[PDB]
RNA sequence: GGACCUGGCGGUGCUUCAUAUCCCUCUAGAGGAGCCUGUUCUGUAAUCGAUAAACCCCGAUCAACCUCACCACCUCUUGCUCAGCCUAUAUACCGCCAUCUUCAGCAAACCCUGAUGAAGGCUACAAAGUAAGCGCAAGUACCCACGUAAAGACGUUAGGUCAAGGUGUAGCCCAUGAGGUGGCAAGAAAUGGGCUACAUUUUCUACCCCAGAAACGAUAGCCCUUAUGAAUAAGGGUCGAAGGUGGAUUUAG
C-alpha cells in the first residue's frame, strides 16, 4: 500500500556540506548517499551488486565520514585548545638533561561494555646513572645489588612495576623503591667493606 | 533452564569450588608446606578428607557453552569445534578466515 | 582503564607492609615463616586489596589461634 | 564432498544472496564478516562473551522482526557503542518498525548494560544474487 | 543561509598547575584489513601535522595465528579444516607533545576509531627527581 | 535451550526427510508424507498468553484524538481470543486439507481423457 | 531521531508525531518490563555501575512503622501514608518526626474532588505540632489542587498563630478588584519575603485580560522589577506583550518592543520560569498579527529548547512561513528549500499566492511535487487552488510539456479514492483548467477526458472557449461528435455552434444539423 | 545463565512478542501427539 | 538502453559530489583520484579487486552488447543478420576480397581480445582459420590500407629485459671506492660491500671465513663467483649476515658477492655470470607440511 | 519367445598413455626383538559407536575422581526446565563429512532425426544442434606467471554419525528419568600403526664439526625423588636379556 519516496540522491546539490550531512560514524545508508559506489563479484556477463541491496558496504567499515575538509574543519577547531611545546626542549640530549627520570605506563584498548584489563597496571621507569649517583661507592654497591635491571651498554637502569593493581599505586611504591634504595646504597657494612 | 543434567552438575561443582575457593588454597598450602608440624600437617590433610565433594577444581570440566561437549573445545572461544566451524562458515564472528597458507 | 575502582583509596604501603598486620607472633618462628611468605605472596599479588589480604591474615591467625595447642 | 553454509544446486528457480551463495572459504577473498569486533584478535579477551551475546541478539531481533528480514545481521562494535544493521522489507508498517525498533533498543540496552543503535535499509523485496 | 551568529564557546581554565610533559607517545594499531589501518594512519598523521607536531611512521611484521579443526563430526582424522587470524600492526610515533596535546588528540582519534581495530598507546613522560633522595 | 533453538525452515527439512535415502532408487515411501506449515502467517505478532493491548501494533495508536496506554485483557477476553485462533486453525487446515476432484476421464488413475486447457500463449502473442 | 531511509521517513506532521510516541510508548513498555522482572538485568555485567541502567524499587518493606515512615517520601504514593498514618494514630499514638510529618503533609497537598476532601479533612487529626511549615504548605495544597476559601482561612489561621507560599495565596485571592489587588499587592511588599519575582507573574497570569487602566500599570511594575533589578524579563515581559492584545495595532509600543526583545536576544538566556514555552508560541502569534520581516529575523546559543512542544513548533513555523511569504520572493523559497525536510495546507496556499503575486511560474510544479511525495494526498483544496493560479498560465509555450505531465500526475491522485466519494465532486470544480492545460501536444488526452466530464457538468464560459479552440485546432467529423453533442446538451454550445457550423461543419451531414435546428 | 536467557524469552513470549518458531512447532507436535494418544 | 546515459549522468554527478567532498576543482579530476578516494572512504581486506568497491565509468563496467540489429520493423541492418557471425563474416569477406584485389595486382590479437571487441561469441576454428589468412596474407606483399588494417589487430610483442641489473658504485672516506649488494635465501638475510683496491682476507660479521666455515663445500660456494670470473686476489669484501642454516648462509653471501661484484665487473662478464647461473634467487623453500598426512609430502600407509 | 535403446562387463581388438604409478628400475621403511598405543578374542557386575578400499593413537587437539552414557547398593516423583530420557530407528532426517576425485562432466529452456519408439544429435576444405546455469578452469591465499594449498558439480555406496546439537515415528513417562558411595577399565592369547635400538656413518666427552677414548641397546621391571592434585608425568640408583637388520607379502616418495 504505502510506497517510499525517491531517495535524496537528486536532491543533494553539487554544493553540500558532507561533513555536516555525515559528521560521525554511522553506517552507509544508500539512499541517503548519492555516489553509484558498487561492490561485489561481478557475474558472468554482469556486474558488482547495485548500491541499494549491497549489504558489503555495511560489512566492512565505513570511512565516507572523517574527510579531508572535515579533519581540516576539526584542526582548525581543536588548535585553540591544544598547547605548545617548549622550543627549548628540542632534543633527546637536552631533555633528559632537564628531566633525566623517563617514566611510560601503557594499557590497551578494546571494543565492547567492559574496560578494565589487569595490563592497566604495567609501569617501568628508566635512568641513566652516568649523571644521577654522584659517586662510585654507592654505584658499585647498587650494580652489585641489582641483577640485571642495569645496562651498561646503553647506560641506563630500567625497572618494572606491577605488584599493584592500579597506575597510580605502582608509582608510588616505584618513587619509593627507588628513594629507599638510594638511601641504603649510601650507608654500607662491615661485612660489605670486607670483601 | 541449562541444557543437561550434567551442565547441571558442572555449574554446581564451579560454584561450589568458587565459594570455598580461598579455603582450600589456604588448607592445601597448609598441607604441602614443609617446615611446619606434621601433625599439623595431618589434622589439613583429614579437614581436606573431611570438606564436602564436588568442591576441589579437578572434579569440573571445560565443557562447552551450548552444545555441552566435553570434549573438542577451544578455551579461548568455549565453544564446540562443531559449533565453531559452523558459525566461523557462516562468517557469524569477525576476523576468521580458512588458512589456505 | 580506573574511571571508578580506586581500592577506596587504598595505598601501595597499606598493601605491601604488613608489619602492622603481623604483632601477635615473634619474628623467629615456624608461625613467623609461614606468615611472612604468605604476606610476600600477597604483595606480590595485586589483583587483590588490603581488604582481601587482612581477611586472609585474620582467617590464619584464628586458624592457628585455636589450634594453638601444639606450639611445637 | 564438503557441505558447510552453501547452497544446493536446484534446476535454477531458486533466489540466493550474496553471503549464502559463496561459499565459506570466500569470507575475506569475496565477503566480509559480519560482525566486528576485537575480541578474536591477540591480546584481547572476553571472546567468548562477544560471540555467545552476537548469537544471542541475531536470533533475538530474528525472532522479533518474523518475516521483514532479508540478510543476516551487521554488527559493528566501536568501543562501548554498539551499532546493528539489518535490512528488512516493507511489508509492515512503519508504526510497528519504529515501535519494535525502540523496544529493542530498550531491552539491548537494559539487558547488556550497553549503549546501542540500530538502523534498517527498507527494500521492497529481497534482492536476489543468482537463481541457483 | 542559515549560519549562526554567535558560535557556543565551551569554558576553559589555565590551571595554576604545569601541565605535564610527554616524551614520546608510542600507539600501535592493531586490526585485520590493511586498506582500513592505511587510512587510519594517514587520517591520524594528517591530523597530527595539523596539529602542528612532528610524526614518524613504521609498520611492524603481520602476524598470524592457525589452528586446526576436524573436517566431520565422527570419524575422519585424516580429513581436517584449518582457520587462522591475521592480525595487522601499524605504529605511530610522536615526540615532544604536551600533555594537554596528548589528551586531546588522544580523545579526537578515540572518538574516530573504526570497529575492526585496538589501540595500544605507550606513554613516556620526563620528570624532574624526588625531593627525598 | 534459547541457544539450543534455530531457524523452522532447517527443523522442516528435517522432519520432511525429502532427500537422502527415501527418495532415491524410487524406493519412495509407503504412501504417509508431511505436508510442511507455515506458522508465521498463521498468527500476527501480537498474540501472546498475557494479552496486553499494544497501540503501537495490536490497537491503533489514537482513538477519538487521544492517546493510548498499555492495558490488560483480561481473562474472559483472553479466552475469547484463544477460542477465536483456535477455530481460525481448524478452518484453515480444514481449507488446505480438501477433496481434489480432476474429470475422470478414461478412468480413475488413468490420465487419458484429461485436458489441460488451451495451448500456451507464445512470445510474439498468439492466444489458442 | 527519525529514521534515514525513505519509507520510514515520517513524511507529514501527525503522522511524525505518532510515530515518535509510538517510540515514547516502547520506552514506557522496557520500563515495564524493568520494574516488573528486575531479576533478569539485575546482572552487573558493565564494569561501571549505572543506577540508570539498574532495574527500578519501589516496593514496601516489611512492617515497621520508622523505616516504613522514612521509606514513605521514597514511594511517592498516598496509600503507603494512608496505612502509615493509621498505624501511627490508631495503635501507636507517636510521631516519629517534625519534619516527617511536614513531608506526608508536602506528598499528600501535592496529591490532592471527594478524595481531595477526604484527604484535607484527614490532616486536622495530626499531632498538635504544626509549624508554619505545615500551615503553609496545606495552604499550598488547598490553592493549587481546591477551592479558595479554604486557603484564606488558613492563611488568617496562620496570622493568628514564604515566597511561593504567598503566590499560591495571591493566585487564590485573585482568581475589577482593584482595592483588592491594590491592598495585596501593599501588604506584600511591605513584608519582608522579597519573593523571587514568581508571584509577580502569577499576578499577572491572572491579570492576562485586562483594559489600559492595568495594561499600563504593568509598564511602570515592570520598570520596578528593573530597578530592584532581579527580572531577567523572561514571562512576565511576554505576558504584557500578549495583554496588549486588539482592534487597532499600536506601531509605537510595538517599536518600542521591538528594541526590547532586541536587547534581549543580543544578551544571552537562561531559563528560570517553567512557561518559557508559551513564549515562543504567543510570541509568534503576535508577531503574525505585527506582520515585519526584520522582526522575523530578529526573532529567529542554545535558546532553540524553548520550541518544545510540536504544536508550538507547527504554530511558529506556519506564522513565519506566511510572514515570509505575504512580505522578491527567491530568497525567501530558497529559506524554504533548505528547511523543507526539516520542517513539515494552509502555507502551501500562502506559498502559491505568493508565487502568483511574483509570476515565477515554473517554481510551482517542484512545490507541488514535493507535497505529493510527503503528504500531498486525498484533497483537492490545493490542487484546486493550483490548477487556477496555473491556468489563469499559457505563456510559456514550451512549458506545456510540464502542464500536461503536472495535469495527469494530479488526475492520477484525483481518481485514486473512488470509495471515499470525495473525488466526484473534484472534477465539477477543477477538470476545466486541467482539460485545458492537457489540450495545451497531446489532444486525444484531453478529449475522451471533456467526454467522461460532460458524461459524469456546471458548463461556464472558459469551457465554452476550451470546446471552440479545441474543435478549431482540420477534423470536422472528429470536431463535430463533440461540439454538437454538447450543443444538444446545453444551450451556450449550441449558440457557439450557431457559428461553429460555418466554417466546414454543416455540408458533411444534414441529421446532425438536424438536431441542431431542433434544439435551436 | 541459560536461566535467566530462557526464562526472560519465555516471558517474553508469553508476552507476545518474540514468535519463538522453534517452540511453535515443538507445541504443533505436541498438540498432535495429545490428539493421536 | 537509456539506463545507460542515465548511469552516466548520475556518474559524473557523483564524481562532481565527491570532488567538492575532497575539495578540490571538480572540473580537473582523475580516475586515480576516483580509486584513491574510495579506497579511503571504503577500505575493504577482500584480496581481489573485482570484489573491492569500485566507482567507475559506467561505460567500462557495462559491457558492450549488440545493438537492435534491424529497424522498427522489416529488415534489419546488415546483410548477414539471417545468420550469426555477420560481424565476422563481414570481416572475413572484405580480407578475401583485399586479398584477391592484391593477387590481380601481383604480435598477434587474442581471441578473447577478439571477442571483447565485437559483440559476439567466437570458437578457436575460426579463430584458428582467421589467423590462418591474416599469416598467408601477411606472407605477401601489402599495401599501407592493409598494413594498418592489420596493425589495427596487432598488438605489442612487449618484450621483457633479460639482463641482470647493475646497482651504482659508492664512495666513503679516504676516498675508497665500493659496491654494497644484498643477498637473501631460504631464510638468511646478508649485505655485502666489495672494496675494489683492497684485496686479500674477507671479513663476516667480523670473523674471516677461514675459521666461520670449518667446511669446504661452504668455502667452495663463497670462491665460485671469484673462481668464475678470474677475479680472486685483487677485490676484497666485507659482509654482515642473519640466518639460520649453515648453506642458507653460503648461498646468500654468493648472492650477494655476485651482485656486488656485477657493478665493478663489465657488462659482458655480467652476461656471463648470468649464464652461468648465479645471478638468481632460487624459489625453492621447505614445502608446507599437511594436515592430514605425516610430512609436506608422505603420508600414511595406506593399510588396505 | 523374436528384434532393439542406454549402461555395466569382457582372462575384448587397434591406437595413445600411466604423473612415483603398471612393471623394469632408485631410496628408506612395515611383517625380526622390546616398548607405547588401538583392534580382535578370554573372563568380569561392568558403557557405546565406526569396525574393506573409503576404521584400527578412529569419535578422544585424552579415561586416576566429574569426563562416565555401564554395573552393585542407597534415595527423589511435577521431578532447574510450562518436565525429562546417551531409550529403538543413520533403512525418516537436518546439520557435518569419507568416496570415485590423482574425474570432467552435469545440465534448465528450445530445435531436429529416427515412418513423430525406447533413444540420439560427433565430422571445420564442416553434414543439426543452439545453450541459460553449475562445476572444471581463470583469478585470489603462501614466495612469482610455476608449485603447494584451497576448490572439486550431478550422482554411486539406504556409506558414517539419533551419543555435538535438534528433530519425524515408536516407547519409559514410580523411570528405560534424576541424585550419591564403590570399583569398573586385567591379559593363557592373535593382529595393526608408531618409538627404540640389532653398530662401528656407531657409543661417550667440550664445541657443533680438523680432538681424545670404547669397541653396543630399557621411554621395560625394582627402589627413591619431585610436578600438580584432596587423593598419571619428569628425574636419579640398580637390573644390562631379547636383540646380530627381518617368513611369505607389503607401504611412502
Ligand atoms: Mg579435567
Ligand atoms: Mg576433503
Ligand atoms: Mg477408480
Ligand atoms: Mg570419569
Ligand atoms: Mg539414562
Ligand atoms: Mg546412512
Ligand atoms: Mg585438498
Ligand atoms: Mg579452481
Ligand atoms: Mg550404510
Ligand atoms: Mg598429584
Same mark, same amino acid.
Given at each position: ?19 555536516? =550531512?555525515?559528521? =560521525? ?7 541517503? !548517499? ?34 579531508? !575538509? ?75 645489588? !641489582? ?49 | ?101 | ?72 | ?73 551487521? #554488527? ?15 511489508? #509492515? ?40 | ?133 | ?128 | ?71 514513605? %517520601? ?26 516527617? @510529618? ?10 490532592? @474532588? ?8 484527614? +490532616? ?38 514564604? /515566597? ?148 508550538? %513548533? ?16 527567491? /530568497? ?5 528549500? &533548505? ?17 502568483? /503575486? ?11 511535487? &514535493? ?62 483548467? +486541467? ?68 466554417? &466546414? ?16 | ?37 | ?73 522489416? $529488415? ?169 642454516? $649453515? ?58
Amino acid at each position: 500500500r504505502r510506497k517510499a519516496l525517491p531517495p535524496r540522491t537528486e536532491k543533494m546539490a553539487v554544493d553540500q556540506d558532507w561533513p555536516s =550531512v555525515y559528521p =560521525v560514524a554511522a553506517p552507509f545508508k544508500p539512499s541517503a !548517499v548519492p555516489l553509484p559506489v558498487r561492490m561485489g563479484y561481478p557475474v558472468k556477463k554482469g556486474v558488482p551488486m547495485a548500491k541499494e541491496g549491497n549489504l558489503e558496504l555495511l560489512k566492512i567499515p565505513n570511512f565516507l565520514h572523517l574527510t579531508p !575538509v572535515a579533519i581540516k574543519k576539526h584542526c582548525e577547531a581543536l588548535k585553540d585548545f591544544c598547547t605548545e611545546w617548549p622550543a627549548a626542549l628540542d632534543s633527546d640530549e637536552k631533555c633528559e638533561k632537564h628531566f633525566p627520570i623517563e617514566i611510560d605506563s601503557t594499557d590497551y584498548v578494546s571494543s565492547g561494555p567492559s574496560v578494565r584489563n589487569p595490563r592497566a597496571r604495567v609501569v617501568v621507569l628508566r635512568v641513566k646513572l652516568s649523571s644521577l649517583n654522584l659517586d662510585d661507592h654507592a654505584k658499585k654497591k647498587l650494580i652489585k645489588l !641489582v641483577g640485571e635491571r642495569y645496562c651498561k651498554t646503553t647506560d641506563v637502569l630500567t625497572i618494572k612495576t606491577d605488584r599493584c593493581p592500579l597506575r597510580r599505586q605502582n608509582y608510588d611504591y616505584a618513587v619509593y623503591l627507588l628513594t629507599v634504595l638510594y638511601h641504603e646504597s649510601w650507608n654500607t657494612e662491615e661485612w660489605e667493606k670486607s670483601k | 533452564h541449562y541444557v543437561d543434567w550434567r551442565m547441571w552438575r558442572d555449574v554446581k561443582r564451579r560454584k561450589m569450588a568458587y565459594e570455598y575457593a580461598d579455603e582450600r588454597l589456604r588448607i592445601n598450602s597448609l598441607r604441602k608446606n614443609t617446615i611446619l608440624p606434621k601433625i599439623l600437617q595431618d589434622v589439613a590433610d583429614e579437614e581436606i578428607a573431611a570438606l564436602p565433594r564436588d568442591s576441589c577444581p579437578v572434579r569440573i570440566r571445560n565443557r562447552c557453552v551450548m552444545t555441552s561437549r566435553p570434549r573438542g573445545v577451544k578455551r579461548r572461544w568455549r565453544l564446540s569445534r562443531i559449533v565453531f566451524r559452523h558459525l566461523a562458515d557462516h562468517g557469524q564472528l569477525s576476523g576468521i578466515q580458512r588458512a589456505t597458507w | 582503564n580506573e574511571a571508578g575502582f580506586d581500592d577506596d583509596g587504598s595505598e601501595f604501603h597499606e598493601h605491601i607492609f604488613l608489619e602492622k598486620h603481623l604483632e601477635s607472633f615473634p619474628k623467629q618462628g615456624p608461625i613467623r615463616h609461614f606468615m611472612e611468605l604468605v604476606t610476600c605472596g600477597l604483595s606480590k599479588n595485586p589483583y587483590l586489596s588490603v581488604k582481601q589480604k587482612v581477611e586472609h591474615i585474620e582467617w590464619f591467625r584464628n586458624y592457628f589461634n585455636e589450634k594453638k595447642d601444639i606450639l611445637k | 564432498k564438503n557441505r558447510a553454509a552453501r547452497v544446493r544446486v536446484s534446476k535454477g528457480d531458486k533466489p540466493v544472496t550474496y553471503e549464502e551463495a559463496h561459499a565459506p572459504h570466500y569470507i575475506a577473498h569475496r565477503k566480509g564478516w559480519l560482525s566486528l569486533h576485537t575480541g578474536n584478535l591477540d591480546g584481547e579477551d572476553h571472546a567468548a562473551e562477544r560471540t555467545v551475546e552476537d548469537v544471542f541478539l541475531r536470533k533475538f531481533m530474528w525472532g522479533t522482526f518474523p518475516g521483514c528480514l532479508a540478510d543476516q545481521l551487521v #554488527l559493528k562494535r566501536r568501543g562501548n557503542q554498539l551499532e546493528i544493521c539489518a535490512v528488512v522489507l516493507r511489508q #509492515l508498517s512503519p508504526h510497528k518498525y519504529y515501535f519494535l525498533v525502540g523496544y529493542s533498543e530498550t531491552l539491548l540496552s537494559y539487558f547488556y548494560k550497553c549503549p546501542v543503535r540500530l538502523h534498517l535499509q527498507t527494500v521492497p523485496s529481497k534482492v536476489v544474487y543468482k537463481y541457483l | 543561509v542559515d549560519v549562526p551568529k554567535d558560535l557556543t564557546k565551551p569554558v576553559v581554565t589555565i590551571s595554576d598547575e604545569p601541565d605535564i610533559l610527554y616524551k614520546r607517545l608510542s600507539v600501535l594499531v592493531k586490526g585485520h584489513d590493511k586498506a582500513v589501518l592505511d587510512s587510519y594512519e594517514y587520517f591520524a598523521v594528517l591530523a597530527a601535522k595539523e596539529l602542528g607536531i612532528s610524526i614518524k611512521v613504521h609498520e611492524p611484521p603481520r602476524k598470524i595465528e592457525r589452528f586446526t579443526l576436524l573436517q566431520s563430526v565422527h570419524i575422519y582424522k585424516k580429513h581436517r579444516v584449518q582457520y587462522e587470524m591475521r592480525t595487522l600492526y601499524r605504529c605511530l610515533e610522536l615526540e615532544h607533545l604536551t600533555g594537554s596535546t596528548a589528551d586531546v588528540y588522544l580523545e579526537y582519534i578515540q572518538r574516530n576509531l573504526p570497529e575492526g581495530v585496538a589501540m595500544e598507546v605507550t606513554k613516556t613522560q620526563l620528570e624532574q627527581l624526588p625531593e627525598h633522595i | 535451550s534459547f541457544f539450543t533453538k534455530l531457524t523452522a525452515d532447517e527443523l522442516w527439512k528435517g522432519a520432511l526427510a525429502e532427500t537422502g535415502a527415501g527418495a532415491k532408487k524410487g524406493r519412495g515411501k509407503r504412501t504417509k508424507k508431511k505436508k510442511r506449515k507455515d506458522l508465521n502467517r498463521g498468527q500476527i505478532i501480537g498474540e501472546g498468553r498475557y494479552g496486553f493491548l499494544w497501540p503501537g501494533l495490536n490497537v491503533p495508536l489514537m482513538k477519538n484524538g487521544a492517546v493510548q496506554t498499555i492495558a490488560q485483557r483480561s481473562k474472559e477476553e483472553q479466552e475469547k481470543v484463544e477460542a477465536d485462533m483456535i477455530q481460525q486453525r481448524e478452518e484453515w487446515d480444514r481449507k488446505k486439507k480438501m477433496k481434489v476432484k480432476r474429470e475422470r476421464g478414461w478412468s480413475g488413475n488413468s490420465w487419458g481423457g484429461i485436458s489441460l486447457g488451451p495451448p500456451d500463449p507464445g512470445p510474439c502473442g498468439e492466444t489458442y | 531521531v527519525f529514521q534515514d531511509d525513505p519509507y520510514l521517513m515520517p513524511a507529514s506532521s501527525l503522522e511524525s508525531r505518532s510515530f515518535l510516541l509510538a517510540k515514547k510508548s516502547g520506552e514506557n513498555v522496557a520500563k515495564f518490563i524493568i520494574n516488573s522482572y528486575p531479576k533478569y538485568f539485575q546482572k552487573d555485567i558493565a564494569e561501571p555501575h549505572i543506577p540508570c541502567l539498574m532495574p527500578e524499587y519501589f516496593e514496601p518493606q516489611i512492617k515497621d512503622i520508622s523505616e516504613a515512615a522514612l521509606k514513605e %517520601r521514597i514511594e511517592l504514593r498516598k496509600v503507603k501514608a494512608s496505612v502509615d498514618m493509621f498505624d501511627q494514630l490508631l495503635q501507636a499514638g507517636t510521631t516519629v518526626s517534625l519534619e516527617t @510529618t511536614n513531608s506526608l503533609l508536602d506528598l499528600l497537598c501535592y496529591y490532592g @474532588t471527594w478524595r481531595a476532601k477526604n484527604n484535607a479533612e484527614r +490532616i486536622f487529626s495530626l499531632m498538635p505540632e504544626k509549624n508554619e511549615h505545615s500551615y503553609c504548605t496545606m495552604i499550598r495544597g488547598m490553592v493549587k489542587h481546591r477551592a479558595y476559601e479554604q486557603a484564606l482561612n488558613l492563611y488568617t489561621e496562620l496570622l493568628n498563630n514564604d /515566597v511561593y507560599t504567598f503566590n499560591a495565596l495571591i493566585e487564590a485571592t485573585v482568581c475589577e478588584k482593584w482595592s483588592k489587588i491594590l491592598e495585596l499587592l501593599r501588604h506584600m511588599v511591605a513584608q519582608k519575603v522579597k519573593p523571587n519575582l514568581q508571584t509577580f507573574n502569577t499576578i499577572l497570569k491572572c491579570l492576562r485580560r485586562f483594559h489600559v487602566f492595568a495594561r499600563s500599570p504593568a509598564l511602570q511594575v515592570l520598570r520596578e522589577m528593573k530597578a530592584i533589578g532581579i527580572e531577567p524579563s523572561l514571562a512576565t515581559y511576554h505576558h504584557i506583550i500578549r495583554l496588549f492584545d486588539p482592534g487597532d495595532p499600536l506601531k509605537r509600543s510595538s517599536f518600542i518592543i521591538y528594541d526590547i526583545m532586541n536587547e534581549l536576544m543580543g544578551k544571552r538566556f537562561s531559563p528560570k520560569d517553567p512557561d518559557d514555552d508559551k513564549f515562543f508560541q504567543s510570541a509568534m502569534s503576535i508577531c503574525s498579527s505585527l506582520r515585519d520581516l526584520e522582526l522575523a529575523y530578529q526573532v529567529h546559543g542554545d535558546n532553540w529548547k524553548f520550541i518544545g512542544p510540536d504544536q508550538h %513548533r507547527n504554530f511558529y513555523y506556519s506564522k513565519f512561513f506566511d510572514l515570509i511569504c505575504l512580505m522578491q520572493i527567491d /530568497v525567501t523559497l530558497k529559506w524554504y528549500e &533548505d528547511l523543507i525536510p526539516s520542517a513539515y495546507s494552509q502555507t502551501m496556499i500562502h506559498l502559491l499566492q505568493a508565487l502568483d /503575486v511574483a509570476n515565477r511560474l515554473e517554481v510551482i510544479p517542484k512545490i507541488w511535487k &514535493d507535497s505529493k511525495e510527503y503528504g500531498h494526498t486525498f484533497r483537492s483544496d490545493l490542487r484546486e487552488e493550483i490548477l487556477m493560479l496555473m491556468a489563469r498560465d499559457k505563456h510559456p509555450p514550451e512549458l506545456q510539456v510540464a502542464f500536461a505531465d503536472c495535469a495527469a500526475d494530479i488526475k492520477s491522485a484525483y481518481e485514486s479514492q473512488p470509495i471515499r466519494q470525495t473525488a466526484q465532486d473534484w472534477p465539477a470544480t477543477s477538470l476545466n483548467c +486541467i482539460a485545458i492545460l492537457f489540450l495545451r501536444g497531446r489532444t486525444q488526452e484531453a478529449w475522451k477526458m471533456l467526454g467522461l466530464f460532460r458524461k459524469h457538468k456546471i458548463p461556464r464560459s472558459e469551457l465554452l472557449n476550451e470546446l471552440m479552440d479545441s474543435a478549431k485546432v482540420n477534423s470536422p467529423s472528429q470536431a463535430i461528435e463533440v461540439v454538437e453533442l454538447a450543443s444538444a446538451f446545453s444551450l451556450p454550445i449550441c449558440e457557439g455552434l450557431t457559428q461553429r457550423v460555418m466554417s &466546414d461543419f454543416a455540408i458533411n451531414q444534414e441529421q446532425k444539423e438536424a438536431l441542431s435546428n431542433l434544439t435551436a | 545463565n541459560h536461566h535467566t536467557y530462557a526464562e526472560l524469552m519465555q516471558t517474553l513470549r508469553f508476552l507476545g512478542l518474540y514468535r519463538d518458531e522453534h517452540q511453535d512447532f515443538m507445541d504443533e507436535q505436541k498438540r498432535l501427539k495429545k490428539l493421536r494418544g | 538502453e537509456d539506463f545507460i546515459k542515465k548511469q552516466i549522468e548520475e556518474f559524473n554527478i557523483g564524481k562532481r559530489h565527491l570532488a567538492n567532498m575532497m575539495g578540490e576543482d571538480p572540473e580537473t579530476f582523475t580516475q586515480e583520484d576516483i580509486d584513491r578516494a574510495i579506497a579511503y572512504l571504503f577500505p575493504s581486506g577482500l584480496f581481489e579487486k573485482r570484489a573491492r568497491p569500485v566507482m567507475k565509468h559506467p561505460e567500462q563496467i557495462f559491457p558492450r552488447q549488440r545493438a537492435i540489429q534491424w529497424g522498427e520493423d522489416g $529488415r534489419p541492418f546488415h546483410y548477414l543478420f539471417y545468420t550469426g557471425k555477420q560481424s565476422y563474416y563481414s570481416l572475413m569477406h572484405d580480407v578475401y576480397g583485399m586479398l584477391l584485389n592484391l593477387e590481380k595486382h601481383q604480435r598477434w590479437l587474442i581471441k578473447e581480445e577478439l571477442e571483447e571487441m565485437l559483440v559476439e561469441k567466437l570458437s578457436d576454428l575460426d579463430y584458428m582459420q582467421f589467423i590462418r589468412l591474416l599469416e598467408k596474407l601477411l606472407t605477401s606483399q601489402c599495401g599501407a590500407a592493409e598494413e594498418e588494417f592489420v596493425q589495427r589487430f596487432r598488438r605489442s610483442v612487449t618484450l621483457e629485459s633479460k639482463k641482470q641489473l647493475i646497482e651504482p658504485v659508492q664512495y666513503d672516506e679516504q676516498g675508497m671506492a665500493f659496491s654494497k649488494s644484498e643477498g637473501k635465501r631460504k631464510t638468511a638475510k646478508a649485505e655485502a660491500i666489495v672494496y675494489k683496491h683492497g684485496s686479500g682476507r674477507i671479513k663476516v660479521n667480523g670473523i674471516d671465513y677461514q675459521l666461520y666455515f670449518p667446511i669446504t663445500q661452504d668455502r667452495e660456494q663463497l670462491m665460485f663467483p671469484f673462481h668464475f670470473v678470474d677475479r680472486l686476489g685483487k677485490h676484497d669484501v666485507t659482509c654482515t649476515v642473519s640466518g639460520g642454516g $649453515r648453506s642458507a648462509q653460503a648461498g646468500a653471501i654468493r648472492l650477494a658477492m655476485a651482485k656486488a661484484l656485477c657493478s665493478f665487473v663489465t657488462e659482458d662478464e655480467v652476461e656471463w655470470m648470468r649464464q652461468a647461473g648465479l645471478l638468481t634467487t632460487d624459489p625453492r623453500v621447505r614445502e608446507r607440511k599437511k594436515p592430514g598426512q605425516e610430512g609436506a609430502r608422505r603420508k600414511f600407509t595406506w593399510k588396505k
